[PDB]
């Protein structure tokens, strides 16, 4: 039910703050998180209002800062819609965090 | 009744096919295209297929080339949508075109 169709930046720096574009199948505004996480589990949130999401299709979003903003190298992370309400996600998206 | 809400991008090199997001009212898949103008009146096309229309609220497409590749400063021109079977235009949008 939840999807990630396309994303217009598949990285960002560990800082977060970023600004990203993702086109989804529908959405409910006041229903929907995006969660960066990585399995070692640490997860982050796109920072965002129901006002940022585009008439249920997309959504524009801040990157959270990634768990160490003092990595040497790239850590890939993944990315899902969930439902705050049941939980339920999207199949997820691969992510890259660099350093600063 | 046409309107670009947001561009993830507005501006761009001259030389062009460089991809931009921008979410809109709802607009038809075949009935939509993105027009990028300058009034001296010089126009150019976003290049994107009806699949390239997300659910009738985004458009993914590729910057056209600018009329002149070899300017040295930026050159200012607007973005509008435009409906292709009666021609009516969104408000536009400043796009600024910089050299290579």
């Given at each position: 039910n939840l999807k990630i169709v396309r994303m217009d930046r598949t990285a960002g720096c560990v800082t977060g703050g970023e600004e990203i574009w993702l086109l989804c199948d529908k959405v409910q505004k006041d229903d929907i998180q995006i969660r960066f996480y990585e399995e070692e589990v640490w997860e982050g949130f796109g920072d965002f209002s129901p006002?940022?999401?585009?008439?249920?299709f997309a959504i524009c979003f801040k990157t959270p800062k990634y768990k160490?903003?003092?990595?040497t190298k790239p850590a890939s992370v993944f990315v899902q819609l969930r439902r705050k309400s049941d939980l339920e996600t999207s199949e997820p998206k691969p992510f890259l965090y660099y350093p600063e």
């Open positions: 006002t940022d999401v585009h008439r249920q160490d903003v003092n990595i």
